[PDB]
Design a protein around this motif. Structure first.
Motif, PDB file in Angstrom:
ATOM      1  N   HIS A  68       0.799  -1.218   0.000  1.00 52.91           N
ATOM      2  CA  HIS A  68       0.000   0.000   0.000  1.00 52.91           C
ATOM      3  C   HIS A  68       0.832   1.268   0.000  1.00 52.91           C
ATOM      4  CE1 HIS A  68      -4.011  -1.863   1.519  1.00 52.91           C
ATOM      5  NE2 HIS A  68      -3.233  -2.823   1.051  1.00 52.91           N
ATOM      6  N   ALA A  69       0.133   2.390  -0.091  1.00 48.44           N
ATOM      7  CA  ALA A  69       0.764   3.689  -0.057  1.00 48.44           C
ATOM      8  C   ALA A  69       0.478   4.209   1.341  1.00 48.44           C
ATOM      9  CB  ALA A  69       0.145   4.607  -1.096  1.00 48.44           C
ATOM     10  N   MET A  70       1.520   4.597   2.063  1.00 48.52           N
ATOM     11  CA  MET A  70       1.324   5.124   3.404  1.00 48.52           C
ATOM     12  C   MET A  70       2.384   6.162   3.703  1.00 48.52           C
ATOM     13  SD  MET A  70       0.545   3.013   6.852  1.00 48.52           S
ATOM     14  CE  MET A  70       2.096   2.716   7.725  1.00 48.52           C
ATOM     15  N   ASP A  71       1.934   7.390   3.906  1.00 53.14           N
ATOM     16  CA  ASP A  71       2.834   8.487   4.201  1.00 53.14           C
ATOM     17  C   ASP A  71       3.024   8.615   5.697  1.00 53.14           C
ATOM     18  OD1 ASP A  71       1.386  10.167   1.416  1.00 53.14           O
ATOM     19  OD2 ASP A  71       3.422   9.347   1.559  1.00 53.14           O
ATOM     20  N   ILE A  72       4.157   8.114   6.172  1.00 51.94           N
ATOM     21  CA  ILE A  72       4.488   8.153   7.587  1.00 51.94           C
ATOM     22  C   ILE A  72       5.222   9.457   7.871  1.00 51.94           C
ATOM     23  CG2 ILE A  72       5.712   6.946   9.428  1.00 51.94           C
ATOM     24  CD1 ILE A  72       5.277   4.355   7.840  1.00 51.94           C
ATOM     25  N   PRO A  73       4.649  10.294   8.748  1.00 52.16           N
ATOM     26  CA  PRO A  73       5.168  11.602   9.160  1.00 52.16           C
ATOM     27  C   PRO A  73       6.477  11.607   9.939  1.00 52.16           C
ATOM     28  CG  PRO A  73       3.489  10.947  10.665  1.00 52.16           C
ATOM     29  CD  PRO A  73       3.449   9.943   9.529  1.00 52.16           C
ATOM     30  N   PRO A  74       7.242  12.702   9.822  1.00 49.40           N
ATOM     31  CA  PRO A  74       8.529  12.875  10.508  1.00 49.40           C
ATOM     32  C   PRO A  74       8.329  12.821  12.021  1.00 49.40           C
ATOM     33  CG  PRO A  74       8.357  14.389   8.694  1.00 49.40           C
ATOM     34  CD  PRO A  74       6.973  13.833   8.918  1.00 49.40           C
ATOM     35  N   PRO A  75       9.413  12.590  12.777  1.00 45.95           N
ATOM     36  CA  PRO A  75      10.770  12.390  12.257  1.00 45.95           C
ATOM     37  C   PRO A  75      11.021  10.979  11.718  1.00 45.95           C
ATOM     38  CG  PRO A  75      10.824  12.138  14.584  1.00 45.95           C
ATOM     39  CD  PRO A  75       9.421  12.625  14.251  1.00 45.95           C
ATOM     40  N   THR A  76      10.175  10.027  12.108  1.00 47.22           N
ATOM     41  CA  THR A  76      10.315   8.643  11.656  1.00 47.22           C
ATOM     42  C   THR A  76      10.211   8.513  10.139  1.00 47.22           C
ATOM     43  OG1 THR A  76       9.529   7.624  13.712  1.00 47.22           O
ATOM     44  CG2 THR A  76       9.290   6.343  11.681  1.00 47.22           C
ATOM     45  N   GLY A  77       9.267   9.238   9.545  1.00 49.58           N
ATOM     46  CA  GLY A  77       9.095   9.195   8.104  1.00 49.58           C
ATOM     47  C   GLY A  77       9.606  10.466   7.441  1.00 49.58           C
ATOM     48  N   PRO A  78       9.559  10.557   6.098  1.00 46.68           N
ATOM     49  CA  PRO A  78       9.053   9.523   5.187  1.00 46.68           C
ATOM     50  C   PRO A  78       9.849   8.234   5.311  1.00 46.68           C
ATOM     51  CG  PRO A  78       9.020  11.627   4.100  1.00 46.68           C
ATOM     52  CD  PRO A  78       9.857  11.796   5.357  1.00 46.68           C
ATOM     53  N   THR A  79       9.229   7.118   4.942  1.00 49.11           N
ATOM     54  CA  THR A  79       9.884   5.819   5.029  1.00 49.11           C
ATOM     55  C   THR A  79       8.997   4.702   4.501  1.00 49.11           C
ATOM     56  OG1 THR A  79      10.909   4.200   6.553  1.00 49.11           O
ATOM     57  CG2 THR A  79       8.982   5.390   7.332  1.00 49.11           C
ATOM     58  N   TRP A  80       9.627   3.621   4.058  1.00 46.79           N
ATOM     59  CA  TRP A  80       8.883   2.460   3.608  1.00 46.79           C
ATOM     60  C   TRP A  80       8.589   1.706   4.906  1.00 46.79           C
ATOM     61  CZ3 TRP A  80       8.083   0.390  -1.499  1.00 46.79           C
ATOM     62  CH2 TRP A  80       8.642   1.144  -2.531  1.00 46.79           C
ATOM     63  N   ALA A  81       7.596   0.827   4.881  1.00 46.66           N
ATOM     64  CA  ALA A  81       7.253   0.019   6.052  1.00 46.66           C
ATOM     65  C   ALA A  81       7.187  -1.451   5.620  1.00 46.66           C
ATOM     66  CB  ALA A  81       5.918   0.454   6.623  1.00 46.66           C
ATOM     67  N   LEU A  82       7.970  -2.300   6.280  1.00 46.89           N
ATOM     68  CA  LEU A  82       7.983  -3.718   5.960  1.00 46.89           C
ATOM     69  C   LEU A  82       7.143  -4.462   6.994  1.00 46.89           C
ATOM     70  CD1 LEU A  82      11.788  -3.973   5.226  1.00 46.89           C
ATOM     71  CD2 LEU A  82       9.909  -3.680   3.560  1.00 46.89           C
ATOM     72  N   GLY A  83       5.884  -4.721   6.640  1.00 49.27           N
ATOM     73  CA  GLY A  83       4.970  -5.406   7.534  1.00 49.27           C
ATOM     74  C   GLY A  83       4.829  -6.899   7.299  1.00 49.27           C
ATOM     75  N   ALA A  84       3.653  -7.430   7.632  1.00 51.85           N
ATOM     76  CA  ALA A  84       3.367  -8.859   7.500  1.00 51.85           C
ATOM     77  C   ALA A  84       3.683  -9.446   6.124  1.00 51.85           C
ATOM     78  CB  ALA A  84       1.899  -9.132   7.860  1.00 51.85           C
ATOM     79  N   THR A  85       3.362  -8.717   5.063  1.00 48.77           N
ATOM     80  CA  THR A  85       3.626  -9.211   3.720  1.00 48.77           C
ATOM     81  C   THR A  85       5.089  -9.640   3.605  1.00 48.77           C
ATOM     82  OG1 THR A  85       2.124  -7.459   2.961  1.00 48.77           O
ATOM     83  CG2 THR A  85       3.288  -8.756   1.283  1.00 48.77           C
ATOM     84  N   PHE A  86       5.975  -8.845   4.197  1.00 51.01           N
ATOM     85  CA  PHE A  86       7.413  -9.117   4.168  1.00 51.01           C
ATOM     86  C   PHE A  86       7.828 -10.159   5.209  1.00 51.01           C
ATOM     87  CE2 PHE A  86      11.898  -8.266   5.023  1.00 51.01           C
ATOM     88  CZ  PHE A  86      12.410  -8.055   3.756  1.00 51.01           C
ATOM     89  N   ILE A  87       7.338  -9.998   6.431  1.00 49.08           N
ATOM     90  CA  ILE A  87       7.681 -10.907   7.511  1.00 49.08           C
ATOM     91  C   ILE A  87       7.240 -12.349   7.245  1.00 49.08           C
ATOM     92  CG2 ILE A  87       7.464 -11.312   9.980  1.00 49.08           C
ATOM     93  CD1 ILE A  87       6.976  -8.266  10.286  1.00 49.08           C
ATOM     94  N   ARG A  88       6.150 -12.529   6.505  1.00 51.26           N
ATOM     95  CA  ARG A  88       5.665 -13.868   6.167  1.00 51.26           C
ATOM     96  C   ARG A  88       6.748 -14.630   5.409  1.00 51.26           C
ATOM     97  NH1 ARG A  88       0.464 -11.829   5.613  1.00 51.26           N
ATOM     98  NH2 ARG A  88       0.699 -11.012   3.479  1.00 51.26           N
TER      99      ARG A  88
END
Length: 329
Positions: free
Chosen positions: A290-310
């Protein structure tokens, strides 16, 4: 110590914890993206239908409960919860710790009516904890019982064990090959440097580097709006209000997506990221990206969730501020 997880539709992975004396049971998601613990409160107005549909913590039924009352609001990517702080004994995977957690009294129908779980257990660092509440993993470490200051996640495929968290180490039974670690960009956040993202034959993304937040609480792999637009255009996917779809008959034909992390290429096949519900060309199939705009200071950034962890068993190492990946078994 290990926690047994239940897999709900490949989007929600949750285990059980017990709060109070006698123990009041709750289904919770373990999230490396946040650092607070919270469950719905008996003090939550039943006008919040989500509260009518979940287990509610009742402090007046626990003799080990300790009042605090400090107000707190927790803001996630897909929703917000508000309430107040309380302390009590929490049982997690056999370990017993006194913990400060949130009793939620405001829990919006959307999206919580769609939540199988009742609450969340933050597995992040204290630097990201709201109200500077000591995170549950720091409290467990303070007991000096774990053999290692690390925890590991195993997320199974939908099937129908749903998944498993190990406090203190890793379970050789659910991974093969060896781990390959990437150092954390900084302590306080389970975020790592990502050298690049490639789709099929063209590393047209995250050129020059970018950030990757290893998020066990995120259902999908996410990127900024700009990044996902490109990735999706390359996939031939159409955008909708909350996701991206592809005509089912073309799901199996979608190219591999690779993620360059710490000198290693982590590759997902279309079978790994598309919800192959059918094969008809008259139907739409959602993608686990998905597209998810994670706000600073942590973001912008990609997020590796369940799809990846699986696909990749993940170990979070607090002692060495690193994250390790290994092929899930």
């Amino acid at each position: 110590s290990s926690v047994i997880l239940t897999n709900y539709m490949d989007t929600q992975y949750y285990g059980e914890i017990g709060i109070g004396t006698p123990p009041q049971t709750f289904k919770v998601v373990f999230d490396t993206g946040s650092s607070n613990v919270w469950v719905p409160s008996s003090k939550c107005s039943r006008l919040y239908t989500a509260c009518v549909y979940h287990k509610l913590f009742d402090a007046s039924d626990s003799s080990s409960y300790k009042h605090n009352g400090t107000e707190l609001t927790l803001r996630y990517s897909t929703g917000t919860v508000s309430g107040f702080l309380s302390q009590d004994i929490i049982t997690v995977g056999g370990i017993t710790v006194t913990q400060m957690f949130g009793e939620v009294t405001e829990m919006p129908a959307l999206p919580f009516m769609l939540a199988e779980f009742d609450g969340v257990v933050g597995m992040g660092f204290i630097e990201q904890a709201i109200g500077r509440v000591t995170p549950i993993f720091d409290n467990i470490i303070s007991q000096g019982v774990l053999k290692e200051d690390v925890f590991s996640f195993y997320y199974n495929r939908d099937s129908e064990l749903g998944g498993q968290i190990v406090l203190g180490g890793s379970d050789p039974q659910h991974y093969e090959g060896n781990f390959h670690y990437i150092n954390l960009i900084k302590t306080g956040v389970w975020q790592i440097q990502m050298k690049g993202v490639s789709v099929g034959s063209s590393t047209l993304l995250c050129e020059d580097g970018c950030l990757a937040l290893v998020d066990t609480g995120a259902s999908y792999i996410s990127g900024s709006t700009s990044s996902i637009e490109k990735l999706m255009e390359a996939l031939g996917a159409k955008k909708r209000l909350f996701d991206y779809v592809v005509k089912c008959n073309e799901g199996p034909t979608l190219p591999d997506i690779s993620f360059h992390l710490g000198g290693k290429e982590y590759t997902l096949t279309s079978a790994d990221y598309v919800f192959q519900e059918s094969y008809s060309s008259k139907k739409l199939c959602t993608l686990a990206i998905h597209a998810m705009d994670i706000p600073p200071p942590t973001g912008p950034t990609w997020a590796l969730g369940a799809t990846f962890i699986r696909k990749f068993y993940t170990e979070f190492d607090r002692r060495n501020n690193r994250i390790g990946f290994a092929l899930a078994r």
